[model samples]
Target: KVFERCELARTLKRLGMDGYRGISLANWMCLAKWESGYNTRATNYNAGDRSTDYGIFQANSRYWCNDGKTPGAVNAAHLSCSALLQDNIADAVAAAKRVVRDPQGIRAWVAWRNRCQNRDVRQYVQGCGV
Candidate 1:
């Protein structure tokens, strides 16, 4: 828990994603804060809640984790190292590296993901604001 955010951040950095700079860190922080409030043990009782049922990506346990839909090169399930690919910045950056060679993808990410929830966020958050 204490090292989890950092672990997620570092993994993304290694994949050529810059966190402290562009909207990457903001995006990661946004998702993490919303998903688990940075609590590794946090669980959502999905009788009515909106987030997915389980896992770091909070994958719906019914369809993803226990049922076996997403496959990997070595693991029967998606690797946490790769789950970021689905939504997390670690995965997004890994994915973006295949094409994006620039520094901060501030505009690209916000446009693509519609990640403009930070009423308090400055800079990049301005253009995305309605």
Candidate 2:
């Protein structure tokens, strides 16, 4: 389920991502763009940490979801990593919300810092009616 740009934007907005923890929807949109390119089933394995990032938001196994491979990892999102990989993003979105509740907020995502931080992110939701 690779979403079109505006489709994802609208979806995120509908899911209350617009201003969760003071992070705008556009920033969320930008993060998803870089993290998974709006692909719901995207997965990335980190050999260094022995963890995997899953789903559209790329929630990591080390901190957010449980994949049973990350050393000493806890299911902070209170769900399985497999839940994040589903085509329906409801669980993924809930897990992402839990992620931002941490001290780093959206900064928890490295992709957001490197690509979306301090940039003009409005383009991500420019015409999505969000």
Candidate 3:
């Protein structure tokens, strides 16, 4: 499922993304914009590490979700990678919350650092009513 910007923002907020670990809702929206363009089934295979990124937040098989093939992979999210691809996004959101519990916080997603960090991210949720 590909979500509209406002729809995703509202959904994320309902999932308690707003101010999660001090990361604002707009920042989360920005991350999703760049990571998967709000598409629930998005997946990107990393040839360099032989791992894959799954779902809107692009959770990686190497450290977060288990795909059964990535070397030294760990199911840190305690979920199968396939769970992240589902349209519901509940599992994906929970995994993302678990990821930020580390020292990296939101910096765990490189895309967020490059695109949302220290930038004016308010526009992402400006009119979303979130």
Candidate 4:
């Protein structure tokens, strides 16, 4: 199921990307919108590399979760991709925080790189009371 915007915002605030490390909840929300539109089952396949991105955060299987079809998959998130494609995202949120805390950080996300970098995404949290 797709998450309501505000609900997801609040959840994210309490879980991953809580903004304690610098990136704001608003930024995380914007990134989520551009990445998966709040859908838990969202997936994007790469026509060129045959790789796939999964879930609301659009984490790439290239370095994160395994899609089950890909053998010998190096899962940085240490969880199955299918695990991320669920309504309950506690593990997914923790994984996202792990990624953000990595050396590469949120810049690992193409959405943040392409759309949210250096921008005021505070608008994403307006009216959400976050």
Candidate 5:
């Protein structure tokens, strides 16, 4: 399922991720937009590494997920990538929380690093009234 911007905001807020673990919802929303545009089925396949980033959060097979197609998968969230694209993002939120605990924090997301980091991201959820 793909979330309409405001709906995604509401759902994310309900999961305690509006400012999850101190990361702003704006960055999270911006990350989701750049990563998957809120499409649960989104996947980014890297031909060079043969790894894939899965779901709305774009959890990577390189470290945070298992795609089966990705060998030596670490499965850091201890869950399947296929399961993260549910209509609800409870697992996605949980997995993301773990990702944030890493030393780089929200920078765990390359999208966040390249786009949202240390930048004002209020526009990501602005009109959504989130």
Candidate 6:
């Protein structure tokens, strides 16, 4: 829980992922767990095709961050800026919320997770905003 308090959690809360008004921390945690296991420094190694992305959100930083479009991003930016926390946290959280905006979103997100996830609750009560 090193980064689970204060500045860290505050960032997520302010960005719309805390309290009782939105998806809550558990929801975000579940998504992050499935995406990157909370590893802020994790990266894929598929080679040439860029088999792996990095950050706690496992974002495709190359396409999102300004420095990503450069000549040799992915491993290149790490050398220059040295920002472990991808500059795309806001975008990542937004994407996650968009995926669970409604029951339909949940269904779509669940299907995507199904690629490597055996969802616990596949069935849901209709009309549920989630």
Please tell me which predicted candidate would have the highest lDDT against the true structure: 3
For TM-score, candidate 1 versus 6, the one ahead is 6
Residues 24-47, candidate 3: write the lDDT tens digits. Answer: 999999999999999999999999
Candidate 6 residues lying further than 4 Å off, grouped into runs, are 1-11, 19-24, 66-112, 115-130
Whole-model lDDT, candidate 5?
0.85
lDDT of all the models against the reference? 0.40, 0.91, 0.94, 0.82, 0.85, 0.46
Model 2: residue 88 alpha-carbon error in angstroms: 1.1
Q: Report the lDDT tens digits of candidate 5 across residue range 78-119.
A: 888877778778888899999998888888888888888878
lDDT, candidate 4, 1-130, per-residue tens: 7989899989887774666467788878888888998998999988676778889898878778877765445788888888889898787786787688787678878778899888888778889877
Model 4 ranges with Cα > 4 A deviation: none
lDDT of 6 at 66: 29
Alpha-carbon RMSD, each predicted model: 9.4, 0.9, 0.7, 1.6, 1.4, 8.4
lDDT score for candidate 2 against the true structure: 0.91
Find the 10 residues in a row with the least total lDDT in model 6: 121-130
- lDDT at 124, model 5: 73
Query: Positional deviation of 25 in candidate 5, in angstroms?
Result: 0.8
**Candidate 2: TM-score?**
0.96
TM-score versus the correct structure, for each prediction: 0.39, 0.96, 0.98, 0.90, 0.91, 0.44
Top TM-score model:
3
Poorly placed runs, candidate 3 (over 4 Å):
none
lDDT measured at residue 57 in model 1 versus the true structure, 0 to 100: 33
lDDT of 6 by residue, 4-90 (tens): 323444566678776333445544555555556555555554456553454555444443232344444454222222243554466
Clashes per candidate, residues 3 or more apart or on different chains: 2, 0, 0, 0, 0, 1
The stretch of ten residues in a row with the least summed lDDT in candidate 2 is: 66-75
